[PDB]
Design a protein around this nucleic acid. Structure first.
Ligand SMILES: [Mn+2]
Ligand SMILES: [Mn+2]
Ligand SMILES: [Mn+2]
Lengths: 481, 189, 483, 190
DNA sequence: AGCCGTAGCTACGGCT
DNA sequence: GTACCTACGGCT
DNA sequence: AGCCGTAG
């Protein structure tokens, strides 16, 4: 009937602010994903978009995600999927894209209609054991679908691919890291819960950008890992070389992370034009898919190229800082976290995933073993089984008679009635016996894991080591002292 | 973008400020074109609390609202020159719809304050749920939100001017820390 | 190889494009009345299980599925085509049941495909009826990863019912919509007399029937269009002159001509008044509402003749609009200007083929099932020997051959016995198998009777058309005034 | 919209007129930015045979092509002022791509006729199939259509000027009947 | 000052 | 076929 | 004229 403007403002703004914080701009500490990214990857998993299968139209993927889980603009979903396919944006790309998916020059991807996409091999590790009761599922926006609250994330994705999100009252800026370094850090933490940031830094040297480049000093890295906030100076990989006739040039082969190459070139061109920099005769972008990134700055004869390079670092994005602000959703709430807290929350998620997977595999093995026990009784007394079914007028009568005579459960009797005549052949008979013996050994193996917390932790360690050996790569960004 | 009404008597005329062009066209069909006017807003409108006067007066969405209301702004505001005695904020029953509503109330409080004081500013109550205005048929938008027979309009009231000034400065102002402190104190996870 | 003559390049490239627009874009097929985009939408809805009993699905999901599987063109082309099929002012018999803003008569477009939802209408089930009963030929899709229909069975005459309008290369098409009761009655009259004249067919089909209703001036334009495939039909708005108080009058328009934009028509009246090209108009309002329907009011100046103003409005504004009939449809994969009889003749021939092919399919299916039941009959009569034959066999292949030799069974019969679940061995199953066999032999005989007589087949086509006419047939909307 | 090349020597420079902005950005990455230039065209180009001179000179796509080629038009055409010795028509291997090609050849024949005569106009040969240019990767577009080492370019040749004038008037002109008669006579429905 | 990243025009034919 | 208005925080 | 409806 009536509404006070102060109460209306406070309630409406708080409702929006909270939604951007917990359901839009901030990633979860466990899988390193924002709701849009998680819905894309889960969408790809439900659509069967694994790396072994053929690429599917991006418009079909986006549309499916939009209708089933993400009730927002198609451009928001598509541009998020595009970023996950760019090897200059993602240190470990999550989407394998076909067609124009953009460039370092800020050129966008081709329209949704033209591009195609699927999962990368590393994304299988993010979705590994999702249908094995490892994570809690929640109702979707309209209650017609089920979606994951968090992905199992068998590799530390938050720190690996990083994050950048502008929320309300706060923001986040987590840089990407090297996977070999991160897993080694998790393994060191799993062996010592009282490990210091300094000790963890022996494994994790600092951020590792997909665009490589250089990092100036360790003080900024240290401040960020200890407090969650710090300034990291990024530098382009540039060298001074001769070009003939006693003349020199500056050759840039790597640029800082998130820096637009074309925009950086225009800023150098602007400085030359406005005469704010001296000694530059030419500026060309010799970058190609064959030679890689190559920006050439021709230096005037007898002019000091090292002075020009130093001035370019001061006046252009050739040197750019990364303002670290590690804010992630911890227990559904925003929190400024240090390097240890990020690894601690991740390791706890892995222990839970592996435990819940082992518990699920035990329940399903025990259920299947119960069914095979019924089928084994059925084959041992098949002549009696057949006659019991034949004497029965209905399926319900056959069910009750089988349960009574052969001490079977409802599920066991049902499985016997569902048994096809071809299961009575020698090869199919031995198949039931072979599966059952294997299952008893498997039940014992899973029970051993659940009986010891150290065996469970070692299984987490072993599975992380396997991912490290398969997906772990060399460090790209050089940390200069 | 304005789809005005037949009647030129402001006492019976109503202007609906709708979120999105999709809901805009839908509301233009369902409405009573005799007494109801529609002004669709693209999406997120300019926060006047964070913007400079030159940027506010240059914004197309802001200018379209000033021209439609025909009252003028700030010191030049004339309540007797109002073209509609009902300015209805019609946004989606979601978090972004709530944000557009805060942005619209910020503009009215800082540039057309006597319009709220006269009880001319209202909030439409569309059906609650997962469905947005753009997803609704023209007849269901009429029967549930636009029809004076069955609609439930919330009249925007100003109780304490000092409290409201502080509320608009904290929530919509340039100072992030005070806004962050409000979120932390009132957050129910 | 290295070179190309500009004349040869132009002739080949333009012909390739022209032919594609003609046979695979802008022209409808005479059999189902659909263009490739519309057929792919309706087939898409059928494969997606988007029947009227099921819940609505996001338009973006429907469009995306059609785009990737059958239509490799822009999403706007597919969506806008699906939108028109859902508009009751565009389609005389809507083919798409849409949820959300699907547009209005003012040229107001539909909401973005991300907001709208869609499914089939009950009449669309008749377009797709018996599609999976070998009634129509299926073709490979654009990439060879899917199968699509070359034509839909179309159990009602959709070409004439919903009409068509398409701009191709070297030619165009403009077929108006018609009344379903009138069309089916016309088909039924043709089925009883192959030598029926256009004049006799016109006793059933009075003329076009627009979803927007309105008026048609005379029968001469209708006559020429039905005889030659080309003709001009004068459409008029439904307008009346009434009092508004104080000795003053007004013109009230409640129905406008087909494909005329209401808002654009109002602006043209407003432009004439402003430029003083028309005299006697004091006011112009659009009193149209979802409750009262279409209502355009033109206030007439006191003592001025309103009938004169109305007559001038018909001459100067789209209040009177002509429909240029040019009935070009794809006949045997080629464009052809067709008259009313040719359109009905080709349609009736498609129906005869559909029903024949359906009866042939149902016979093959029944004969196969009878053969399977014969094998199951043998299996139950000798179940103890069947079980032992399977048990003594090491592999499936050995069990298959042993069953075939011992019990005189075919590969299909032996396979069906091995696939038989233990629950099929219950007491009353031998009676159920015998009961199904006896009914199937009667069904085989019933289908064989249909295939043995062309008249019995034709009567079945007639009966099925009558059922659709009684269920979907409605009253005539457009009034044909003489003249 | 023009993404020019590094070299200012027209003898070695090539301009690719690509169909769609999606294929435009893709060709911009795969190209040899030293000798190859890209001018993306939205889609269907203005038919100069049906349009009047004021409309032709006012069209953005037409203006962008004139500015890029730097030769001028009609009577003011200067072959020595050509900025590229290779004007490559790069459209999808489908019916609409064939149409854009006819539209582009109509403009060159009626406004830049000596450009065809000098053998400066070429037709790119992208991989045949269901896939369009916009669906292809930047490296795929380079290796199959843009790389001088593996590409197969068709040089546009003018044999009979009288025959070509009649061909451009019949296929692209305002007279529908002559175009309809051509379709009917040469139509193959096999 | 402005950026990061999730959100809220043309062809073609026929009109007469 | 294509586009450019906006919120939001933190760094330059 | 500029509009109808599938296409880039
Ligand atoms: Mn919304
Ligand atoms: Mn008229
Ligand atoms: Mn194409």
């Amino acid at each position: 009937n009536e509404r006070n403007i102060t109460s209306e403002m406070r309630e409406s703004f708080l409702d929006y602010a909270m939604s951007v914080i917990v359901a839009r701009a901030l990633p979860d500490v466990r899988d390193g994903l924002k709701p849009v990214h998680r819905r894309i990857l889960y969408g790809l998993n439900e659509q069967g978009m694994t790396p072994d299968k053929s690429y599917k139209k991006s418009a079909r993927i986006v549309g499916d995600v939009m209708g089933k889980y993400h009730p927002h603009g198609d451009s928001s979903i598509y541009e998020a999927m595009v970023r996950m396919a760019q090897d200059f944006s993602y240190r470990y790309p999550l989407v394998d894209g076909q067609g124009n998916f953009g460039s370092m020059d800020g050129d966008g991807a081709a329209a949704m209609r033209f591009t195609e996409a699927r999962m990368t091999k590393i994304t299988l590790e993010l979705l590994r054991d999702i249908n094995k009761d490892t994570i809690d599922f929640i109702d979707n926006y309209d209650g017609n679908e089920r979606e994951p609250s968090v992905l199992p994330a068998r590799f530390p994705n938050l720190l690996a691919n990083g994050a950048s999100g502008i929320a309300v009252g706060m923001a986040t800026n987590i840089p990407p890291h090297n996977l070999t370094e991160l897993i080694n850090g998790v393994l060191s933490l799993s062996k010592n819960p009282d490990i210091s940031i300094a000790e963890l830094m022996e494994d994790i040297e600092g951020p590792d950008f997909p665009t490589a480049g250089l990092i100036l000093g360790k003080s900024g890295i240290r401040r960020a890992y200890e407090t969650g906030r710090g300034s990291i100076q990024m530098r382009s990989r540039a060298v001074i070389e001769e070009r003939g006739g006693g003349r020199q040039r500056i050759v840039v082969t790597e640029i800082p992370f998130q820096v637009n190459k074309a925009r950086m070139i225009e800023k150098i061109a602007e400085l030359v034009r406005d005469k704010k920099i001296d000694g530059i005769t030419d500026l060309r972008d010799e970058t190609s898919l064959r030679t890689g990134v190559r920006v050439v700055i021709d230096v005037r004869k007898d002019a000091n190229a090292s002075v020009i390079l130093n001035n370019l670092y001061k006046q252009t994005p050739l040197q750019t800082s990364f303002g670290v602000n590690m804010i992630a959703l911890v227990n559904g709430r925003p929190k400024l976290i240090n390097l240890k807290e990020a690894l601690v929350h991740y390791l706890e998620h892995q222990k839970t995933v592996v435990r819940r997977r082992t518990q699920y595999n035990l329940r399903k093995a025990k259920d299947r073993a119960h069914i095979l026990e019924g089928l084994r009784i059925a084959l041992d007394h098949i002549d009696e089984i057949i006659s019991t079914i034949r004497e029965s007028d209905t399926d319900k009568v056959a069910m009750e008679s089988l349960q009574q005579r052969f001490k079977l459960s409802e599920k066991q009797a049902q499985a016997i009635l569902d048994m096809r005549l071809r299961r009575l052949t020698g090869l199919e008979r031995d198949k039931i016996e072979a599966e059952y013996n294997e299952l008893l050994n498997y039940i014992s193996e899973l029970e051993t894991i659940l009986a010891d917390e150290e065996v469970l932790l070692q299984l987490v360690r072993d599975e992380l080591t396997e991912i490290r050996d398969r997906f772990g790569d060399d460090r790209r960004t050089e940390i200069q002292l | 973008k304005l789809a005005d009404c037949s009647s030129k008597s402001p006492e019976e005329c109503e202007i609906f400020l709708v979120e999105g062009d999709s809901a805009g066209g839908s509301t233009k069909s369902g409405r009573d074109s005799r007494t109801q006017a529609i002004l669709p807003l693209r999406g997120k409108i300019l926060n006047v609390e964070k913007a400079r006067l030159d940027r506010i007066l240059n914004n197309n969405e802001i200018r379209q609202m000033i021209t439609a209301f025909g009252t003028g702004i700030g010191g030049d505001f004339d309540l007797a020159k109002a073209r509609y005695h009902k300015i209805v904020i019609m946004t989606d029953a979601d978090v972004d719809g709530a944000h557009i509503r805060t942005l619209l109330l910020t503009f009215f409080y800082r540039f057309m304050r006597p319009l709220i004081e006269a009880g001319y500013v209202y909030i439409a109550q569309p059906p609650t749920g997962y469905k947005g205005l753009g997803e609704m048929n023209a007849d269901q938008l009429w029967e549930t939100t636009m029809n004076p027979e069955h609609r439930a309009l919330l009249q925007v009231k100003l109780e304490d001017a000092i409290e409201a000034d502080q509320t608009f400065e904290m929530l919509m102002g340039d100072v992030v820390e005070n806004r962050r402190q409000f979120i932390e104190d009132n957050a129910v996870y």
